[PDB]
Amino acid sequence: LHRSYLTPGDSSSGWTAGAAAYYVGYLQPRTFLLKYNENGTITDAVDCA
């Protein structure tokens, strides 16, 4: 979070554009048809639900 220094005048309202945003989703028991490539990498998936 960096208390460090706040430099009043430029960040008076906290922030305007945005520093970062972390996403937290939740995994669910799902059936995934995985398509493997000739190199062994997954290119696309399909969820039945």
Added chain:
Amino acid sequence: FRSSVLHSTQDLFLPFFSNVTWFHAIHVSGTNGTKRFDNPVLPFNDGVYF
């Protein structure tokens, strides 16, 4: 390893086109002056796409 095959697996994956909780967290200099951010505790049901 699997070379150009189709495989079906039953595990815990993130469903497509769902609702993910973007949580913006950073120093927030308040109008009064007290600095805060977005900070609670997020539960870990059985997995997290962080």
Added chain:
Amino acid sequence: NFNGLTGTGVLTESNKKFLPFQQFGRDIADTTDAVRDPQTLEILDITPCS
């Protein structure tokens, strides 16, 4: 019997550039084909024992 992949077969040289993290190597009909050398990084595809 490599790292526990017990089986009989002819171990030949393979063009199976495995993604850098796998080891078992199976098929669609779930047959345990290519296996990576536990010691070195060589991949020998197995075949039926004639």
